[PDB]
Design a protein around this ligand. Sequence first.
Ligand SMILES: *[C@@H]1O[C@H](CO)[C@@H](O[C@@H]2O[C@H](CO)[C@@H](O)[C@H](O)[C@H]2NC(C)=O)[C@H](O)[C@H]1NC(C)=O
Ligand SMILES: *[C@@H]1O[C@H](CO)[C@@H](O[C@@H]2O[C@H](CO)[C@@H](O)[C@H](O)[C@H]2NC(C)=O)[C@H](O)[C@H]1NC(C)=O
Ligand SMILES: *[C@@H]1O[C@H](CO)[C@@H](O)[C@H](O)[C@H]1NC(C)=O
Ligand SMILES: *[C@@H]1O[C@H](CO)[C@@H](O)[C@H](O)[C@H]1NC(C)=O
Ligand SMILES: *[C@@H]1O[C@H](CO)[C@@H](O)[C@H](O)[C@H]1NC(C)=O
Ligand SMILES: *[C@@H]1O[C@H](CO)[C@@H](O)[C@H](O)[C@H]1NC(C)=O
Ligand SMILES: *[C@@H]1O[C@H](CO)[C@@H](O)[C@H](O)[C@H]1NC(C)=O
Lengths: 23, 98, 315, 49, 182, 49
Amino acid sequence: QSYTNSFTRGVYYPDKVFRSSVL
Amino acid sequence: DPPEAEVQIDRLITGRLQSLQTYVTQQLIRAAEIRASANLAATKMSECVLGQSKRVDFCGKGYHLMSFPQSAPHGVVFLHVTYVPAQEKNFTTAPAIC
Amino acid sequence: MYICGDSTECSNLLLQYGSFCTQLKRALTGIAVEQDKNTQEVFAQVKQIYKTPPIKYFGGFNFSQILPDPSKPSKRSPIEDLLFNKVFNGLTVLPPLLTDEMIAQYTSALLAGTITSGWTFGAGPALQIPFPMQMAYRFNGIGVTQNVLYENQKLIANQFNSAIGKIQDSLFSTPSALGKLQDVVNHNAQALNTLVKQLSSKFGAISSVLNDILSRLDPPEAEVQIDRLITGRLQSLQTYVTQQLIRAAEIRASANLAATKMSECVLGQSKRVDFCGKGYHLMSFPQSAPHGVVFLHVTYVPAQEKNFTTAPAIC
Amino acid sequence: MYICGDSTECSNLLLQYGSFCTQLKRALTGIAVEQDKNTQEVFAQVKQI
Amino acid sequence: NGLTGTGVLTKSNKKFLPFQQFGRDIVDTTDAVRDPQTLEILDITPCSFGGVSVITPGTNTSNQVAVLYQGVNCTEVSVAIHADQLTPTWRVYSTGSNVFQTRAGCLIGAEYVNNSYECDIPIGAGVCASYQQSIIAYTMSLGAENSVAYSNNSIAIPTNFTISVTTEILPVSMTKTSVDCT
Amino acid sequence: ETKCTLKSFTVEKGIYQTSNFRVQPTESIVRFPNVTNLCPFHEVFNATR
Ligand SMILES: *[C@@H]1O[C@H](CO)[C@@H](O[C@@H]2O[C@H](CO)[C@@H](O)[C@H](O)[C@H]2NC(C)=O)[C@H](O)[C@H]1NC(C)=O
Ligand SMILES: *[C@@H]1O[C@H](CO)[C@@H](O[C@@H]2O[C@H](CO)[C@@H](O)[C@H](O)[C@H]2NC(C)=O)[C@H](O)[C@H]1NC(C)=O
Ligand SMILES: *[C@@H]1O[C@H](CO)[C@@H](O)[C@H](O)[C@H]1NC(C)=O
Ligand SMILES: *[C@@H]1O[C@H](CO)[C@@H](O)[C@H](O)[C@H]1NC(C)=O
Ligand SMILES: *[C@@H]1O[C@H](CO)[C@@H](O)[C@H](O)[C@H]1NC(C)=O
Ligand SMILES: *[C@@H]1O[C@H](CO)[C@@H](O)[C@H](O)[C@H]1NC(C)=O
Ligand SMILES: *[C@@H]1O[C@H](CO)[C@@H](O)[C@H](O)[C@H]1NC(C)=O
């Protein structure tokens, strides 16, 4: 085992809804 | 029953409390614009009536001469006496003469 | 349509609430017809529509960036042209009574009558007067003799032309100049978007959709869940109306000031200090803008002071 | 804190009532920023001291 | 597929990712949907609605009225009127010459004229209406055109005057009320 | 409808906002996913023996 930084990843689509040019 | 009545009374207490708040909230908004129009009428009385105004169109259209207050139900009426030119004539003019 | 939508079960429950809906409809109608009185008081001050002469020589003064542009279809002045490029659940937006092409004619009539007549058109008949002789009267209004203008007319004309030129460079380059107008457009969009987003709230009900309540719950018991939505949505609609009544009083307070500046700064010469800009007021020029008005205050600022020895009297 | 204090059970129930907290918070901020503008317009009328 | 509602379906240029079912707007309202049997994205627009304003010369003068369907294209009111799907059942007579497309909505019952007068009944977007008989809709005139005779060395001086008296009315006070809550 | 809005039998000159117009739906369109995974009914009903 070891330890490493995860940085800014692991983001998934929370749902199956289309959105365009939104925050 | 007392338990069944207390449930259907709070619907009338909450219904009429929101009916009183909606009334008082609108009276505060209306009274804010009556005060705005009552601060203006006190300015017209001080300046149009108790003096002669050089401000344009503040005391009526034209050149102000004098005004007369008349009371009215829940208000005031001003009779603005003004000077209006008439019968203009064409002329030739110069800035200076040598 | 906002509280219930296409729902007969909800509409019947909403009727047993008195005139809560009628009060809101009266409140928004009083605001709407008020916004057409604010625009009329500021601009619709001239009896007639004055026009500038075909020849645009006003003694060396250059009002090209102020007078209407004939080449553009909209007939807006070059400054007005760049002022306009810087700024459904039962909710409808009504169009203003005066089109932006009719407000520009009201402004053009105020500019054409000021350059030609001076302040005479605001107190009766419009009596023409040469612009170098109109500016000599406005120097006598600030305590400077009229021989000062005639002997510095070419110098004074250039200082006005250059000052108008920098006006575009201030609005064209520097942002946030029209933040007063943009703020009253942002606050209206936030209020409407917040009003829509509260149709997704539950307010304690089983769900936020009326159709999902009538089917998933018994009609004897679904009435209670609807009453939670009706109570919640009726309050979120009264909140919207109340804030409009407060904002419409800020606009009416600033629409009365803009009507006071048009009467006194534009249709005359003002002696009130700092009412029409820093300095000694000479002229002012209106320029329309989206949901607003812009005044270009021409003022006289002294410069190049010098020390002297003074006495009260002389024996 | 005014409505729920430090109860997480209450806090979750407060979310179902829409963005009422956000409107109340932005309304009071507009008042506070204005009060600093009222003071400046009256007194800060001189460029120099 | 369980997503219910009412609206007008049309072909949409939106490009769904191949795992999505529908779309949402900035206000969390549905704007599109994928057909479960065709795998095509269908834009959803709500069925038309708006206000209805009735222009009246006054019952003392005539019983004629003109109806303004605010924010509606005349092409869709006439389509819905023919198909009988407009909420307000009552229908104004439409003689082709009395239907006009203003920038505020579809105006039925008023004949548009090319003249211009002072505004009597403000409709919106520069269009007014009056009774002159029948109901006429026109573009309001801002005032009488004037052209002052500006010249390099010409001035106009009044040779007379007029003393005019004008009246201004200002509210001062409201009506005081006290309410017992209990 | 103008008279009932004002609750009067006499209407003055003006323009009155009376009601709201809605275009009613014409027909309903229900679409569901493709029906697949057909049962082997013919393997029993249409057996050779
Ligand atoms: C008044 O000022 C405008 C600019 O605000 C002048 O217009 C310029 O005229 C010069 C003439 O050489 C042209 O090269 C520029 O392109 C023009 N600029 C614009 C923005 O149109 C105008 O000439 C001035 N009027 C007079 C009589 O001098
Ligand atoms: C200025 O105008 C007034 C009216 O506003 C003129 O006075 C009128 O003169 C006529 C002609 O003589 C009389 O019939 C009227 O009775 C007068 N009206 C009054 C007194 O109210 C006045 O003559 C004009 N000044 C001039 C022409 O120098
Ligand atoms: C004044 O002067 C011009 C110069 O031609 C003349 O045409 C105009 O009609 C005159 N204005 C009057 C008489 O009101
Ligand atoms: C006047 O005299 C004072 C004396 O201290 C000097 O500071 C000031 O600059 C002078 N003002 C001028 C030259 O305008
Ligand atoms: C659904 O079936 C039809 C024929 O019944 C076919 O044309 C279509 O491509 C199918 N769609 C999907 C997504 O399987
Ligand atoms: C109404 O639609 C037609 C085309 O069907 C179009 O020409 C017209 O400009 C539209 N009217 C408005 C006000 O959008
Ligand atoms: C005023 O004088 C200027 C310069 O001499 C000239 O161009 C202009 O045409 C004159 N205006 C008239 C005659 O109306």
